[PDB]
Amino acid sequence: DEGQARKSQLQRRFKEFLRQYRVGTDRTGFTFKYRDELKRHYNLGEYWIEVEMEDLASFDEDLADYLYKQPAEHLQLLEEAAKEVADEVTRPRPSGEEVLQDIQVMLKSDASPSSIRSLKSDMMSHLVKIPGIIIAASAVRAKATRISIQCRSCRNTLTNIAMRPGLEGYALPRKCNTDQAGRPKCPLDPYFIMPDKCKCVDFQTLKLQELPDAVPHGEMPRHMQLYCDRYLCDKVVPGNRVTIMGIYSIKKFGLTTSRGRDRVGVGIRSSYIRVLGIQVDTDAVSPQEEEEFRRLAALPNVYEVISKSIAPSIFGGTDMKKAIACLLFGGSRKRLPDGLTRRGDINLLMLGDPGTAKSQLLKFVEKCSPIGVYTSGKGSSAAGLTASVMRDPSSRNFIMEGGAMVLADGGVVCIDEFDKMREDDRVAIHEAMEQQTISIAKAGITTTLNSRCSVLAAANSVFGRWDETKGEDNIDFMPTILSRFDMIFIVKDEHNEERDVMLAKHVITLHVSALTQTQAVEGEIDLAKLKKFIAYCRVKCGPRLSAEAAEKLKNRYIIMRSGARQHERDSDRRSSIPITVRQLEAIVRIAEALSKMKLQPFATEADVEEALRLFQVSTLDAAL
Amino acid sequence: MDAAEVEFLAEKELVTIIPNFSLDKIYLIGGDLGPFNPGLPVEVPLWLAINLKQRQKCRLLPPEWMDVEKLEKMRDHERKEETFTPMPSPYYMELTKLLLNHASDNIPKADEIRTLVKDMWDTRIAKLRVSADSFVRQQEAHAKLDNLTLMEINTSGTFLTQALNHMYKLRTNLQP
Amino acid sequence: DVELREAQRDYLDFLDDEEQGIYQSKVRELISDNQYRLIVNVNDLRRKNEKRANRLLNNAFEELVAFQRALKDFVASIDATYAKQYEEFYVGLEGSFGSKHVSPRTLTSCFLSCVVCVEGIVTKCSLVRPKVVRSVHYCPATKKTIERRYSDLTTLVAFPSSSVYPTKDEENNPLETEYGLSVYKDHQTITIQEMPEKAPAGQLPRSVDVILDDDLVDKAKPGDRVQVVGTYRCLPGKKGGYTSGTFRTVLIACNVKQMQPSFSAEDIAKIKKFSKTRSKDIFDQLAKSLAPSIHGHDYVKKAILCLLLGGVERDLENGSHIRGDINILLIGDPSVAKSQLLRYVLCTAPRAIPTTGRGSSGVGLTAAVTTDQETGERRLEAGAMVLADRGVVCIDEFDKMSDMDRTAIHEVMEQGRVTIAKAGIHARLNARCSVLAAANPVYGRYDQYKTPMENIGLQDSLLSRFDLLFIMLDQMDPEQDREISDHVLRMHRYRAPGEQDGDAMPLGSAVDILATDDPNTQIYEKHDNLLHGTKKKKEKMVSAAFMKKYIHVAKIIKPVLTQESATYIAEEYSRLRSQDSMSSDTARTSPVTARTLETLIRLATAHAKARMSKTVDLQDAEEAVELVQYAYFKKVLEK
DNA sequence: GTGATATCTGCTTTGGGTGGGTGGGTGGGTTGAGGCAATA
Ligand SMILES: Nc1ncnc2c1ncn2[C@@H]1O[C@H](COP(=O)(O)OP(=O)(O)OP(=O)(O)O)[C@@H](O)[C@H]1O
Ligand SMILES: Nc1ncnc2c1ncn2[C@@H]1O[C@H](COP(=O)(O)OP(=O)(O)OP(=O)(O)O)[C@@H](O)[C@H]1O
Ligand SMILES: [K+]
Ligand SMILES: [Mg+2]
Ligand SMILES: [Mg+2]
Ligand SMILES: [Zn+2]
């Protein structure tokens, strides 16, 4: 009774918070924020809301303190209050919407996060805020919220038994409640779960790795298990950087020591986090963002603005920064009626001298790309890059795990030290670079995966520094791999008095400026916005060449082929850099990328002119 | 019609103010506004009341129906019934918004009043949603909506009327 | 209770329709063809009783129980003896289920206790096992028989009955089982996996577990693309009086469909007329129409058409074998559309298995052992070439395959059999497939001044196992460059009629099929200016659907070699083999062997198939000789 | 009336993957593919 009274009072306070909370001022106006959000979400068929802890503290500090210290009970009370308020906001309801739905209440806060390493025993059963990286996600499974049980002998049924949230089970009644007289006694453990009477929700399990910068020196990164349910399920994927609010909890399995439990230490338990809210970190588009993106795409010098924003810390490399912008946006993937596909992704290779910021460029593109994976050729294998076959520990069966080019599907994979890769490992990438699939036939698995990613590779020349006398001996790659690159840049560290003085002053100023507090630059776009702008354009615009632009491209391609053919004849050596139909389609992709920057449905002659200029400076220069 | 124009119509309702100035009877085209005497109550249109309050010339008095007990009874009655119940004012939402935004210092228990008016608004909006769904689903040609205020109709009227126009044209396709 | 009676009444009213007669006739056919499952179209039920259809789709188990009871009553009404014959009659569903059309990714907990239609690929199958339904026991002392019924969580009315058979009567007298009087039903388990092309970016496909019982067993095998209509259920379990609250979910199938052309009389007439129209142009037109988006490699396309049509395999009274499958190898310079031709065959051929040299192993090509899901029994799982039995295997990057892995392909390429002698398993598997392989030369880019044998870099036996070898060269020629550039740019300018300007292809896709039967033939494709150009259109293109029907019909013909064709083939083989240094520049790409004679016969037979002719005539032999002449020799340039 | 001693009751077993890989492979499970060091 007294406990019931206390619970009812707390639920009433949560209900009043939901009914009365307001944002605004008497000069402007007022909005009942949470009541309105609940009403709109329920009408949309989305039975969840997100509540800020600061708002709750503003309304009632004690309620927020209780929610922080004892999250489970008070969160249950808050959900019941949310259900009550959802009935009142929507209470006269249309036919087929009679039954009131449960409301999931998500939690959000402005507090500073805490690390995995800082999670101690004294914080058990508390509300915690943790940053990390998603490294693994399980399949979506069913978790019972309500069960009905029936007696084997007498068919006596107990219905609507509530289940605990999280990774917690239930202990069935030991004995039945039927009358002792007349009937032979019911057997021990008489109850079984009725399949069709059970109410279930979707659940998921995740692994959260600590942030790379938080790892103590010389230690392998640690991870933690996450439990997600209902609308939190299937929100994040491996590779996402997130901040999670949750309950630090313990797995509650059977009390019995079944199979003769024989742990290496006594009284140990398994920890996990019961997730109450997820926030994806930058490192859907609001209408304000969409309007801002449309404004950027319409700037007459948008191409210059984007190029200036790519690795602004690097001193020069304007042509290579322009080509990287095209790679980030990409071309238009197409499927012809016969079923054959033409890829829209752009591949770029930087081959050149040491200390020319090739690795710094690759690191930037990893941060800038909406989907980006950085790997090293030396530290890679054929199975690691594409996909692997291995034994599943639980099932005792063969499974498949994706490599770098599966994790980078839909984005960019940056392969540094490309020359150090073994020939057998390099050759495993040919199919993925052109057909954009990975074919596997191993250990009884015959399947095909998607690998629609752009390759950005860096390498050194054969003799360390490019030697003009050695000629074609500077390049070691086969013609097959080189023909799969849209643009090939030969980077030569040219020594000049005037440029060297300018570069040195830039580098010194860069090191001194590390102390300066960060400031915006008028002519550039910050990385966070550029990252979002790229993602928006790739989903919204797939351009095509205009009929006039195609005629211009056709005529220049024929000239380029004749010049390459003539050059090989005169030199008596077949050139290392080939000029094939793939290079014609490469120019099409680069032209479409330039249009996609401007959100233009058709690529013009100016787009083809710029695409041909980029090709001239990159690949024709290498080939001649 | 937009919401600003419904508010314009609502601003013609009469409220009571206590001025701190003296003025002779004003012969407005709309109608006479009695003499103004400091400390004594007088009835004026809502627009003039708001203007005088903003200029620090008067103190507003809550309408008779802006009472917590009465409003609670009205909200309970609205929740119990199936149709729309008669409202204390034909512009209760606009009057509440204007009065509570500009004169909360003059109206005790303004927060409770605002919450009760919000409850009534939500219930009535849901009833209107049910009415529209029934109109379309059952293929009606006419409906009765008594005790529904102008602001409530205007909140979704254009959408409903456009949908009904399209549906009527689809119902009369086969007639040559 | 009352609701169940009303549902049974409604279903009985639905099946007694003589007063349009579709289900009365369907049940009569069910009786005639010795079946005990009736497939019901939910569209008819929805038309006649909408509420009963909604309940059936949303409360599946109870409604299906009532439906099957009504079906049993109706069948008994038509014929009582037949009803006594079978323990139970089952109902399958088809049609449009609205939002119940899902994939293994979209099949969530909200569909529990509902009827759903799932589309996917079969990845795992199990062995068929019997499941006891009713047990009969006899008491020799007391001379009376007792029956028992069993059910489990997987039955429509879930109940965990005991698996232990009775052994004695209430009186101590012992009991013996009447196995021939009891009832057992077949039971099998499969896994259905999301189609990889539909998966979201960076995500490995999801899967669901399906239970097939009775007739539905063995309707699907691994590698098939299937549509399964069934009911979605959770299987709750306990151990030591404890439940985790996390339950496995299964799909209990009521219908399995495959995703074999169906021929109407009009289509048959069209095919016959097409065959009759021209004598010599049919083959050329079909080959020209094969992969429209590739600018011409005309001889290669003719060879690929021959591969798709195939030859006639010979079985001799003694038991010797001669294959009819045609194998093709394409070695070329970078970017000459080899992989695109392989991909086209993968997209078009009825059974085609893709493979990459670097991504495949001998085990994965032939077969693998592992423990059985149940009992841990050493079992065999088919590899790529066995899955391709009576089909095609497309091997890209053939030169990248390991030599040991390559050696495992010889026996399949020549004899068509795989010998498994491992883990205490001795089996001979049928892998009767055509190999279409693509490769690069040893130096990446073909060196015209070196000989074909030095460029190809493969052993003469493996080359001999290929019916045809094609060296595809990229020669910079301004006119050929102009033609190919025009074709490629036209292809890249094309936009499908449905799409709008500026549209981008999404990565992944939602379920698009909203019915079991597609709600949506012409010989020639309609002209499109971009796809075909502004040329006068003197050459016409055969449409993809008509080509698929025509090739299916032609593959069944078995032309018979005639004396004149045999004489011509023998003379031409003699000329091909005798001719040494026929052209001083010329060199042989592959050695000429009796396999070359068999290849000539195979190509002539395939050509005769294309004409739908019952005999191999001189024209077919001439075409085969022309193909072999083109493929087997290459000029060597002198510097 | 106490000491056996006969009857009755509840526990958990099995090897198994819905019981974990945050138990451990010195507690015990074929087949294949994938990194190493030494190898040629
Ligand atoms: N143009 C430049 N502007 C600014 N910083 C530069 C520039 N070139 C080099 N640096 C700096 O000098 C160092 C060059 O190292 P980095 O790894 O980027 O070179 P790299 O060209 O990839 O060389 P390597 O081929 O030897 O791997 C980094 O600190 C980079 O920031
Ligand atoms: N003759 C052609 N007609 C049409 N498209 C062509 C032609 N030749 C090449 N292409 C196009 O150019 C690209 C060639 O890539 P593809 O994978 O087909 O080449 P490949 O011969 O298999 O090369 P590799 O040996 O390097 O794998 C594809 O886009 C293909 O569509
Ligand atoms: K164990
Ligand atoms: Mg570097
Ligand atoms: Mg290829
Ligand atoms: Zn009981």
As a three-state string, the secondary structure of C9-52 is HHHHHHHCCCCCCHHHHHHHHHHHCCCCEEEEEHHHHHHHCHHH
Q: Residues of A marked as binding for ADP?
A: 342
The CA distance from C16 to A10, in Å, is 61
Chain A: give the shortest CA distance to residue B164, in Å: 18
Measured distance CA(C259)–CA(C255) in Å, rounded: 13
Angle at the Cα of C262 from the Cα atoms of C256 and C267, rounded to 5 degrees: 165
Structural element, H or E, at residue C339: helix C338-348
Task: Give the integer Cα–Cα distance in Å for A167 and A249.
Answer: 9
Residue B107: φ, ψ to 5°? -115, 105
* Residue C61 backbone phi and psi in degrees, to 5: -70, -50
Do the chains C and B touch each other, judged by at least 3 C-beta pairs below 8 angstroms?
no
- Is A512 buried (19+), middle (13-18) or exposed (0-12) by CB count in 10 A? exposed
Can you give the residue ranges of every domain in chain B? Answer: 1-66, 67-176
The answer to whether residue C529 neighbours chain A at the CB level (below 8 Å) is no
A198 touches chain C (CB under 8 A): yes
Rounded Cα distance between C515 and C509, Å, is: 17
Dihedral sign for Cα atoms in the order C500, C505, C506, C512: positive
Residue A486 belongs to what H/E stretch? none
Instruction: Report the alpha-carbon distance of residue C23 to residue B58 in Å, rounded.
Output: 83
For chain B, helix, strand, coil in percent to 5 are: 55, 10, 35
Q: Between chains, do A332 and C505 touch, taking CB under 8 Å as contact?
A: yes
Of C246, C359, C476, the CB nearest to A438: C359
Tokens of A118: 């800082």
Say how far apart CA A49 and CA A56 lie, in whole Å.
Answer: 14
Q: From the centroid of its chain, how far is CA B29?
A: 24
Neighbours of A404 (CB within 10 A): 21
Query: Cα separation of C77 and C71, whole Å?
Result: 10
The two tokens of residue C241 are 């009086």
Angle at alpha carbon of residue C286, lines to C262 and C478, rounded to 5° = 145
Nearest of B18, B10, B7 to residue B103 by alpha carbon:
B18
Reply yes or no on domain B1-66 having CATH 3.30.43.10: no
Distance CA A13, CA A372 (A): 47
User: How many CA atoms lie within 13 Å of A516's alpha carbon, on the beta-carbon side?
Assistant: 8
Whole-number Cα distances in Å, A385 to A119, A159, A445: 35, 53, 18
- Contact between C162 and C231 under an 8 Å Cβ cutoff? The reply is no
> Looking up tokens 């003469």, which residue turns up?
C460
* DSSP secondary structure letters along C115-152: EEEEEEEEEEE---EEEEEEEEEEETTTTEEEEEE---
As given in the structure block, the two tokens for residue A203 are: 């659940």
Whose structure tokens read 């009433």? Answer: A12
Amino acid at C245: G
DSSP string covering A401-434: EE-HHHHTTTSEEEEESGGGS-HHHHHTTHHHHH
> Quick one: how far is CA A450 from the chain centroid?
16
Residues 6+ apart with CB under 8 A from A201: A142, A143, A145, A229, A230, C109
Q: Which helix (H) or strand (E) holds C104?
A: none
Distances (CA, A) of A551 to A545, A558, A580, A598: 10, 11, 18, 22
Q: Which tokens go with C303?
A: 């060879």
Amino acid present at C547: M
- Residues of A at the annotated binding site? 342
Annotated binding residue C380:
yes
C-beta atoms surrounding B150 within 10 Å: 17
Termini Cα distance of chain A: 90
Question: Nucleic chain D: which protein residues 434-453 of A have CB below 7 A from it?
Answer: 442-443
Residues 390-409 in A having a C-beta less than 7 A from any atom of strand D are 390-391, 393-396, 398
Is any atom of nucleic acid chain D found less than 7 Å from the CB of residue A207?
yes
Answer for the pair A56, A71: CB distance below 8 angstroms, yes or no.
Answer: no
Q: Which residues contact A353 (CB under 8 A, 6 or more apart)?
A: A460, A461, A465, A466, A491, A492, A493
Contact flag A26-B104 (C-beta cutoff 8 Å): yes
DSSP assignment string, A560-574: HHHHHHHHHHHHTS-
For residues A391 and A517, give the distance between their C-alpha atoms in angstroms, rounded to a whole number.
51
Query: What is the 3-state secondary structure of C52-89?
Result: HHHHHHHCHHHHHHHHHHHHHHHHHHHCHHHHHHCCCC
CA distances from A613 to A316, A325, A555, C609 (A): 18, 15, 15, 53
The structure tokens listed for A524 are: 């550039």
Distance CA B117, CA B96 (A): 8
Q: Judge whether A203 and A141 are in contact, CB under 8 Å.
A: yes
DSSP secondary structure of A367-387: HHSSSEEEEESTT--HHHHSE
Positive or negative CA dihedral for A588, A593, A595, A601? positive
Helix, strand, coil distribution of chain A in percent, nearest 5 = 40, 25, 35
Any bridge partners for residue C228, and if so which?
C118, C256
Residue having the nearest C-alpha atom to atom 26 of ligand 1: A354
Cβ-defined contact of A94 to B119 (cutoff 8 Å): no
Extended beta strands in C357-442, E state: 367-371, 378-382, 392-396, 417-422, 425-430, 434-439
- Name subunits touching A (3+ CB pairs < 8 A): B, C
Contact C566, C541 (CB under 8 A): no
Chain B adjacent subunits, 3+ CB pairs under 8 A:
A
Largest Cα separation within chain C, whole Å, is 105
- Ligand 4 centre distance from Cα of residue A235 (Å): 36
- Terminal C-alpha separation, chain B: 35
Distance CA(A242)–CA(A248), nearest Å, equals: 17
3-state secondary structure A134-196: EEEECCCEEEEEEEEEEECCCCCEEEEEECCCCCECEECCCCCCCCCCCCCCCCCCCEEECHH
A464 part of contact set with chain C, CB < 8 Å? no
Best residue in B101, B119, B148 for a mutation probing chain A (most A CBs within 10 Å): B101
Q: Using a 6 Å cutoff on CB, does residue A355 contact ligand 1?
A: yes
Q: What SS3 string covers C549-605?
A: HHHHHHHCCCCEECHHHHHHHHHHHHHHHHCCCCCCCEEECCCCCHHHHHHHHHHHH
Measured CA to CA, the distance from residue C386 to residue C353 in angstroms comes to 10
Query: Bridge-partner residues for A192, per DSSP?
Result: A150
Residues in chain B: 176
As beta bridge partners, residue C355 has C395
Sign of the C-alpha dihedral computed for residues A192, A194, A200 and A202 taken in this order:
positive
**Does residue C607 contact residue C615 with C-beta atoms inside 8 Å?**
no
A6-10, long-range: CB < 8 A, 24+ apart: A7/A73, A7/A77, A10/A63, A10/A66, A10/A74, A10/A77
The closest alpha carbon to A491, from A318, A321, A352, A621, belongs to A352
Q: In chain B, what residues touch A35 (CB-CB under 8 Å)?
A: 118, 122
Any CB–CB contact under 8 A between B115 and chain A? yes
Which residues make Cβ contacts (< 8 Å) with residue A610, sequence separation at least 6? A303, A590, A591, A594
Identify residue A369 by its one-letter amino acid code. S
Helix or strand run (H / E) with residue A326: helix A318-329
The residue with tokens 């069960």 is A147
Do C396 and A140 lie within an 8 Å CB cutoff? Answer: no
Ligand 2 site residues, Cβ closer than 6 angstroms: A 342, 434, 480, 483, 581-582, 585; C 294-295, 332, 334-340, 440, 484, 487-488
Contact C109 A254 (CB under 8 A): no
What does C256-320 look like in DSSP terms, one character per residue?
EEE------HHHHHHHHHHHHH-SSHHHHHHHHTSSTTSPP-HHHHHHHHHHHH----EE-TTS-
Distance A151 CA to D25 C1' (A): 41
Collapsed DSSP state (helix, strand, coil) of residue C336: coil
Closest approach of chain A CAs to the CA of B31, in angstroms?
Answer: 31
- C246 CA from D16 C1′ (Å): 17
Cα gap B146→B85, rounded to integer Å: 8
Closest CA to A106 of A239, A229, A285, A241: A229
Q: Which phi and psi (to 5°) does residue A310 adopt?
A: -95, 115
Neighboring chain C residues of A397 at a CB cutoff of 8 Å: 370
- Terminal CA-to-CA distance of chain C, rounded, Å? 95
C371 touches strand D (CB under 7 A): yes
What is the spatial distance, in angstroms and rounded to an integer, between the CA atom of A381 and the C1' atom of D37? 17
Helix (H) or strand (E) holding C355: strand C352-356
The dihedral of CA A429, A435, A437, A440: what is its sign?
A: negative
Nearest CB partner across the interface for C476, out of A335, A442, A561:
A561
Q: How far is A451 from chain B (nearest CA, A)?
A: 46
Q: Is A360 in the pocket of ligand 1 (CB under 6 A)?
A: yes
Q: 3-class DSSP state for residue A615?
A: helix
Q: How far apart are CA C403 and CA C399, in angstroms?
A: 9
How far is Cα A565 from Cα A574, in angstroms, rounded to an integer? Answer: 9
Instruction: Determine how many CB atoms are found less than 10 A away from the CB of residue A548.
Output: 12
A357 Cβ closer than 6 Å to some ligand 1 atom: yes
Distance separating alpha carbons of residues B123 and B83, to the nearest angstrom:
10
Among all bound ligands, the one having the nearest atom to the CA of A182 is: 6
Experimental method: cryo-EM
Cβ of C375 less than 7 A from strand D: no
Distance (Å, whole) CA C204 – CA B165: 48
> Which residues lie below 8 Å from residue A50, measured CB to CB, with a gap of 6+?
A37, A105, A106, A107, A108, A277
**How many residues in total does chain C contain?**
639
**Nucleotides, chain D, CB distance < 7 Å:** 10-15, 17-24, 27, 29-35
| Nucleic strand D within 7 A of Cβ C579 | no
Query: How far is it, in rounded angstroms, from Cα C315 to Cα A362?
Result: 62
Cβ < 7 Å from strand D, A residues 237-256: 251, 253, 256
CA of A202 to C1' of D34 (A): 36
Distance of alpha carbon A362 from alpha carbon A342, whole angstroms: 26
